[PDB]
Amino acid sequence: MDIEERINLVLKKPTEEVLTVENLRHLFEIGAPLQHYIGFEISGYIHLGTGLMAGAKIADFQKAGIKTRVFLADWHSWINDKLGGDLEVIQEVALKYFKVGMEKSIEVMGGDPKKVEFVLASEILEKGDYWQTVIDISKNVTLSRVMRSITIMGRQMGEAIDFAKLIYPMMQVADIFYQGVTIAHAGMDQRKAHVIAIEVAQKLRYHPIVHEGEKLKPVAVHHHLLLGLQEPPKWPIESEEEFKEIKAQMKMSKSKPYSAVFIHDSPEEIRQKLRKAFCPAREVRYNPVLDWVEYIIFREEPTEFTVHRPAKFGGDVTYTTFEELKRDFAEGKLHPLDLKNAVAEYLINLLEPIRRYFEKHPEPLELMRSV
Amino acid sequence: MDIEERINLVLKKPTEEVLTVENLRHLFEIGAPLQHYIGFEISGYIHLGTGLMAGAKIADFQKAGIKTRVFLADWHSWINDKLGGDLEVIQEVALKYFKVGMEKSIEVMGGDPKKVEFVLASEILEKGDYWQTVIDISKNVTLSRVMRSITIMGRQMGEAIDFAKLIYPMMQVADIFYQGVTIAHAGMDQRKAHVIAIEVAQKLRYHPIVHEGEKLKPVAVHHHLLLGLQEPPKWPIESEEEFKEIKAQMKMSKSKPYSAVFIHDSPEEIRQKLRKAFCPAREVRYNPVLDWVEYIIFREEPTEFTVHRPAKFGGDVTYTTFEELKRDFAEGKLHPLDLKNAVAEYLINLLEPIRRYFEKHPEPLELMRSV
Ligand SMILES: N[C@@H](Cc1ccc(O)cc1)C(=O)O
Ligand SMILES: N[C@@H](Cc1ccc(O)cc1)C(=O)O
């Protein structure tokens, strides 16, 4: 495969940022090892952002000849108080529910889960040489820098925060080097860990990434964070900064289940959630539904998306690019009522294999309900 | 032996503090395991405080039926930038110089080196389950608390301090629980780590100390910190808070080589150092020389300490208790000129076995001169 096609595969939506395209091209040209990974805390049900956005990139990376891996961060979740801070439950959930949920997500997004590596973090955390590297990295990062990085775990620096949470970010950086990751993939809210990884890369003594005598810097690839469906806390949004701050607060990972769609939600649950989603007529600056249409439905724009309607409401209309649908919506040619129903049906059909699997094999969801 | 005699062995000088006598007695009575340890950073010649005071307690503990251990804190020293942060050199020094230096110090203080366990920290730090306990402990301690415990490594919270240094205190606490330590021994400046250890003991999940169904709290035993021989930065010393403050600054571990006596110093170096030592006539509040007389020479009293003088200067005088000597000094009946000379000779004779060893086996000191 030509280098341009490989670079494009890495950069295409939903990726939002690559640090940096230059280093990525460099890695491709020198034949450096191409080891990817994206880590996940283990808590509740997998929402569309977690599953579909990561799944889409994993599929793209595979086609680019990059070795992909899903990292189940158990000790990290334990440190971050998930599942009541019960490590054993976290580990059971990771292996019986999360792993398969991700496989199914990767599958519907066009990737091959059989070719994706799955690592439970403890497989490497239980090794002392891993911790020696945590120390090695930590000697190169100021406490101040670590404190400003805790937002990667959806947390804010607060008085009385336990020390274990400060070790977390250093573990995330160590996870990259200990596994020889050259393609560090994550959602945009994890970028701070990757910025640190890139700056300490060439200073590491035990687990630097070495290729033909040179210490490499891993390439960071961040994908877009899908918005939750709830109405924002303020309206109208009055500044670019407000806009960015609100989107940060409104990301689906912080939404209540009623405003977040899960990969195995029922058709009825999907219709209901889209039904109450924030989607004001003609609004295109802040619109959760359009966000999903852009990043899920038009992931690959050389596509077709039809909204079926009676002639009285405009008749059937097929869009080929997100931009076309967006303008139609902004001009009042496409009503929320019809957009919501089309998105719901599209999702119901895309996620069908996932619902089916969790119906055929009921243990995973039984486990989640018991937690 | 009688529990009263066992308690007294733990309590005898140079012990300065025990947290707590009640828990210690409890441990003796219930027959809980008695595992001691005292850790040391690796970064220089062993001065009298390090060798003699620790050695004296190790000897006392052995007689009380406590299993003693010297913990060589290599990664800790690496983290704390000792020996230029060269872990390799730290490890060679620990095994080739420090270990044997301590063995001989324990021996001159009456302990049996052959019955003392010697553990290189990396022996346990190379184990991931040890780090799981570092995490477990860290979940029960706030960042602010760890920041406040930074003084145990001879540092103060700096604006740009590296993160690894904050991990150090949690490692010290973990070292205790991982080795099943019930008698945590250290100099008074390490007490903060032990107060935390006692606070989290019963909350630990992986390495609590369990005896007959109960989670135990280790007993902390702190020994007196011998002062360096240099004159104070200020004189006279006014307030009591100032007294403590200056003593913390003047402790031998922070003194220049010229104001600290090392276990292998030659007879001439010892005479020279005592000769210039701070020891104001009649001063008994702050006097490095009297400090050494009380904790070294009268470690066990009654004993016999004779100051030889010609009749014109009071003639020979033999003391049996520190109190008698102190009185004679306060009253100007014992002059610094004679006391200093007597302390030097006492030290020269006490340390002879050590000098003889390093004289016959020059490798250790040659290594030290090269670092
Ligand atoms: N910090 C990531 C999870 C993660 C954990 C460890 C890693 O190495 C990578 C990612 C999140 O909150 O989603
Ligand atoms: N902090 C101790 C060294 C030490 C390190 C680790 C321990 O577990 C105990 C002691 C000192 O400065 O001397």
- Strand partners for B343: none
Residue B258 labeled ligand binder: no
Write phi, then psi, for A351 (nearest 5 degrees): -85, 0
Q: How many CB atoms lie within 10 A of CB A349?
A: 11
B85: left (phi over 0), alpha (psi -120 to 50) or beta: left
- Strand partners for A40: A72
Check pocket membership of A182 for ligand 1, CB cut-off 6 A: no
Give the whole-angstrom CA distance, residue B365 versus residue B91: 15
Q: With contact defined as beta carbons under 8 Å apart, do A167 and B138 qualify?
A: yes
Long-range contacts from A121-125, C-beta under 8 angstroms, 24+ separation = A121/A39, A121/A71, A121/A72, A121/A73, A121/A74, A121/A75, A121/A76, A121/A175, A122/A74, A122/A75, A122/A91, A124/A175, A124/A178, A124/A179, A125/A75, A125/A171, A125/B128, A125/B131, A125/B132
Give the whole-angstrom CA distance, residue A348 versus residue B70: 65
Check pocket membership of A299 for ligand 1, CB cut-off 6 A: no
Check pocket membership of B77 for ligand 2, CB cut-off 6 A: no
Check pocket membership of B153 for ligand 2, CB cut-off 6 A: yes
Residue A168 CB partners (closer than 8 Å, separation 6+) = A76, A79, A80, A150, A153
Three-state SS for B185?
strand
Q: With contact defined as beta carbons under 8 Å apart, do B118 and B99 qualify?
A: yes
Distance B142 CA to ligand 2 centre (A): 20
Residue A132 labeled ligand binder: no
Token pair listed for A140? 């190169």
Of the candidates B125, B135, B162, the beta carbon closest to that of A142 is on B162
Which experiment gave this structure?
X-ray
Distance A25 CA to ligand 2 centre (A): 47
Give the whole-angstrom CA distance, residue B355 versus residue B257: 17
Q: How many CB atoms lie within 10 A of CB A264?
A: 21
Of B121, B147, B141, the closest CA to residue B204 belongs to: B141
Radius of gyration of chain A (CA): 21
Q: Which fold has domain B1-226?
A: Rossmann fold (3.40.50)
- Strand partners for B19: B220
**Which residue in B has a C-alpha nearest to residue A168's C-alpha?**
B135
Q: Do A162 and B141 touch (CB under 8 A)?
A: yes
CA angle A293, A57, A39 (to 5 degrees): 115
**Which residue in A has a C-alpha nearest to residue B123's C-alpha?**
A128
- Strand partners for B39: B71
Three-state SS for B237?
coil
Q: To what resolution in angstroms was this structure determined?
A: 2.2
Write phi, then psi, for A86 (nearest 5 degrees): -95, 100
Q: Give residue for tokens 């595979």.
A: A62
**Which residue in A has a C-alpha nearest to residue B129's C-alpha?**
A126
CA angle B322, B324, B328 (to 5 degrees): 115
Give the whole-angstrom CA distance, residue B42 versus residue B65: 28
CB < 8 Å from A in window 165-194 of B: 165-167, 170
Give the whole-angstrom CA distance, residue B183 versus residue B37: 7
Q: Are strands B219-223 and B15-19 parallel, antiparallel or unpaired?
A: antiparallel
Q: Give residue for tokens 């006097």.
A: B287
Q: With contact defined as beta carbons under 8 Å apart, do B53 and B1 qualify?
A: no
Give the whole-angstrom CA distance, residue A13 versus residue A274: 23
Of B265, B335, B251, the closest CA to residue B295 belongs to: B251
Residue B272 labeled ligand binder: no
Does any CB of chain A come closer than 8 Å to the CB of residue B335? Answer: no
The amino acid at residue A122 is S
Ligand 1 atom nearest the C-alpha of A154 is 12
Of B221, B209, B214, B131, the closest CA to residue B177 belongs to: B209
Give the whole-angstrom CA distance, residue B142 versus residue B136: 12
SS (H, E, C) chain A: CCHHHHHHHHHCCCEEEEECHHHHHHHHHCCCCCEEEEEEECCCCCEHHHHHHHHHHHHHHHHCCCECEEEEEHHHHHHCCHHHHCHHHHHHHHHHHHHHHHHHHHHHCCCCHHHCEEEECHHHHCEHHHHHHHHHHHCCCEHHHHHCCHHHHCCCCCCCCECHHHHHHHHHHHHHHHCCCCEEEEEHHHHHHHHHHHHHHHHCCCCCEEECCEEECCEEEEECCCECCCCCCCCCCCCHHHHHHHHHHHEHHHCCHHHCCECCCCHHHHHHHHHHCCCCCCCCCCCHHHHHHHHHHCCCCCCCEEECCCHHHCCCEEECCHHHHHHHHHCCCCCHHHHHHHHHHHHHHHCHHHHHHHHHCCHHHHHHHHC
**Which residue in A has a C-alpha nearest to residue B141's C-alpha?**
A162
Check pocket membership of B322 for ligand 2, CB cut-off 6 A: no
| Domain limits, chain A | 1-226, 227-371
Distance B169 CA to ligand 2 centre (A): 8
Distance A123 CA to ligand 2 centre (A): 30
Domain A227-371 is found in CATH 1.10.240.10: yes
Three-state SS for B89?
helix
Neighboring chain A residues of B125 at a CB cutoff of 8 Å: 128, 131-132
Same fold, A1-226 and A227-371: no
Check pocket membership of A78 for ligand 1, CB cut-off 6 A: no
Of B50, B39, B51, B42, the closest CA to residue B83 belongs to: B42
Q: Give residue for tokens 């110090």.
A: B105
Q: Do A162 and B140 touch (CB under 8 A)?
A: yes
Residue B213 CB partners (closer than 8 Å, separation 6+) = none
Q: What is the DSSP letter of B226?
A: P
Distance B282 CA to ligand 2 centre (A): 37
Give the whole-angstrom CA distance, residue A297 versus residue A340: 13
Distance from the A115 Cα atom to the nearest Cα atom in chain B, whole angstroms: 29
Smallest CA separation from ligand 2 atom 6, residue: B172
Token pair listed for B174? 């973990």
